[PDB]
Amino acid sequence: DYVEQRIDLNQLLIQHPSATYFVKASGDSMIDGGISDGDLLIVDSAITASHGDIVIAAVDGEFTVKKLQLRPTVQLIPMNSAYSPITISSEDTLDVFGVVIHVVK
Amino acid sequence: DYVEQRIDLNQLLIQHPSATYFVKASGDSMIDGGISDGDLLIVDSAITASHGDIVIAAVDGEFTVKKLQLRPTVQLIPMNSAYSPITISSEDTLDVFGVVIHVVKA
């Protein structure tokens, strides 16, 4: 007869358990993207970011969660009309620490 | 004759170039420890933190630079009398992202 397999969120939401962590989002520079102040972002640091991905990054030593743009130029763009983009020029340092894979609201 | 061997900060300050990054400190929860709002902290993510090390960590998804205490209990303690400690209980999650190896003031 049937056997009830209990729910396992780690198997459901995490591909790389050893390179995945959660970051709490802040502010609302990313609301239009579904992220809001307080949510938990599930971050995978074992995958390489891509144009379009939402990433936890450090620009000039300060952390942020932004959308990665690699073309036409490397930038960190918000998802809230009120905010303005951040271009990563040569005098600027960009550090990508992982790709946000899920947002837990 | 003699040839001047140009200064190289990376060789001088960085042991693991590929696992080292810089974070800018915030607030003054760590002034008595030499860190002040604005400084660059050179972080080595290739060495495992130890009791006493100052680290970049996330407690319940929020990042911080604190001093790691593994004994008598696991905590994140400031270095400013005005601030109070943070214990890492079972209902809390602690994530250590690297040991601060140097503080660069300006």
Residue A29 a catalytic site member = yes
Expressed in Å, this structure's resolution amounts to 2.5
Who contacts B8 (Cβ-Cβ below 8 Å, separation ≥6)?
none
| Contact predicate B22/A93, CB 8 Å | yes
Count the residues in chain A.
105
Method: X-ray
| Contact predicate A23/A41, CB 8 Å | yes
Eight-class DSSP state of A68: E
Residue B21: list chain A partners with CB under 8 A.
58, 95
Dihedral sign, Cα of residue B69, residue B75, residue B79, residue B82: negative
Two structure tokens written together for B83: 């601030």
Residues of A (17-56) whose Cβ lies below 8 Å from B: 21-24, 40-41
Query: What is the secondary structure of A5-40 as a DSSP string?
Result: ----HHHHH-S-GGGEEEEE--SSTTGGGT--TT-E
| Contact predicate B36/B25, CB 8 Å | yes
Residue B60: list chain A partners with CB under 8 A.
24
Element (H, E) at B56: strand B54-59
Q: What is the domain partition of chain A in residue ranges?
A: 1-105
Query: What is the secondary structure of A42-67 as a DSSP string?
Result: EEETTS---TT-EEEEEETTEEEEEE
Query: CA A1, CA B92: separation in Å to the nearest integer?
Result: 39
Mutate to test the interface with A, among B20, B59, B65, B95 (most CBs of A within 10 A): B95
CATH architecture of the domain with residue range B1-106: Ribbon (2.10)
The CATH superfamily of A1-105 is: Umud Fragment, subunit A (2.10.109.10)
Query: CA A43, CA B47: separation in Å to the nearest integer?
Result: 21
Q: Out of A24, A61, A97, whose CB is closest to B24?
A: A61
Indicate which residues of B carry an active-site annotation.
29, 66
Two structure tokens written together for A56: 């936890």
